[PDB]
């Protein structure tokens, strides 16, 4: 998405953390009109304490993103204050780690509601409006490296981030025909992976990561995983699945399916 | 998991489809004591019509797997009739396809509850009992090739199957220390992928797929994707992510993180 100046961004969890970093970069550098949605009023107040000292257009709204009615109202408010949402940043998220066998249903429901339903709610509230308007748009989903890597004690969290990864890849297929871009950001949160992530944690900066997002939005990039370190580790994870698939290359039914495909490339147009 | 004869299997959705195929193979070939759990009584009756003509130990229980209290009761019933669950097959699943922009919240909630919460409910009901018993066990999660491949109109379904894939990979990390095996089956449900899957659909048989599962359980295999055809397609999908990661190999912060790692392999033990 180009020409971001004056366009409207809606950032969940925007009162703190990664989301605040995104809000800062979009409002200051990109000069977008940014709505920051956060459940906590004090976090909103803090962010506005910062933005009140900058030449920006930022509007706070207190929102529990698990509340579908309130979400719709918050987006209505965004439209009245600034205008139709051009860029949706689904960046809000929670995490509570522990052994999976000790997890409660309340633990599951809480993280599922915020991390998955929160993203679903935003997408389903905003994306149909984008399509109706017919001026395109962009949808950012902030997942995690946990959408690729399961770890001890991150069972629930991992499940929620895989989920929104699937949603993101699904949007990626159906949104382009509406000129709506889709980006999937995986900041994070093999003991080798832990050691590599820890160094990333040490250098991590929300504003710097915000500029990575900005770059991805401008150039309409889907995969936003700015970590070359994880490459060899991911290749190994990928190869497990490939090897699993190829372990049945021997099995007769496969040769039978290949016999049919061979015959069907003959006979027919293309 | 070995020595399956006489051991107890709990199969959700066991009254029909893939799940019934699993139940048949476990009850007849493996000679397990199989509990089939299904929401529909008539499907239960049909399956029992079949099993009543075989020398098997099969017990039906009508269960809405989205009902946590009922699920616990169904597993209690399994313990009273046969004994503690040794093999849990989370195979129940629903699907309703359509353009994502037309999806309702009811569409989301329904498929999320059955496909994701249904699996969570089973795992959280049975797995702590397995651990408490201290005799190990095995957990099968039946996802889909949609846990790897997003497709037009499969947005909700894809999201739910990615989710349980994450849960499966999470279980894979934490369960081995309790001698509990984990298997992830992806039957299915690039226009090339569609064409390849259609030929698989044509040859698909629930009993044959049931024998694939049996083989995976016996040999404690996690990745159960018996389709070599999808290899080259998946490699291409994998390479997108690798290339995305490596696209920042140039960026200074990465070289900075590598400088730190280089120094830390020196200095310290290992």
Numbering used by the authors:
A (entry chain A), B (entry chain A): 1 to 189, 215 to 295
Article sentences:
The first step in the Lig pathway is a stereospecific oxidation of the benzylic alcohol in the GGE substrate to produce β-(2-methoxyphenoxy)-γ-hydroxypropiovanillone (MPHPV), which is catalyzed by nicotinamide adenine dinucleotide (NAD+)-dependent Cα-dehydrogenases LigD, LigL, LigN, and LigO. The final step consists of a GSH-dependent lyase, LigG, that catalyzes the elimination of the GSH thioether linkage in (βR)-GS-HPV to produce glutathione disulfide (GSSG) and γ-hydroxypropiovanillone (HPV). Our structural and biochemical studies of the enzymes in the bacterial β-aryl ether cleavage pathway reveal the features important for substrate and cofactor binding and catalysis by these Lig enzymes.
The SDR family is characterized as a large group of NAD(P)H (2′-phosphorylated NADH)-dependent enzymes displaying an α/β folding pattern containing a Rossman fold; this overall organization is seen in the LigD, LigO, and LigL crystal structures. The superposition of the LigD, LigO, and LigL structures using Cα atoms shows a root mean square deviation for LigD-LigO of 0.88 Å, for LigD-LigL of 0.70 Å, and for LigO-LigL of 0.93 Å, indicating that the enzymes display similar overall structural features. A sequence alignment of LigD, LigO, and LigL shows an identity between LigD-LigO of 40%, LigD-LigL of 38%, and LigO-LigL of 37%. This proposed substrate binding region is disordered in all of the crystal structures solved in the apo-form (LigD, LigO, and LigL) and in the structures of the LigD·NADH and LigO·NADH complexes.
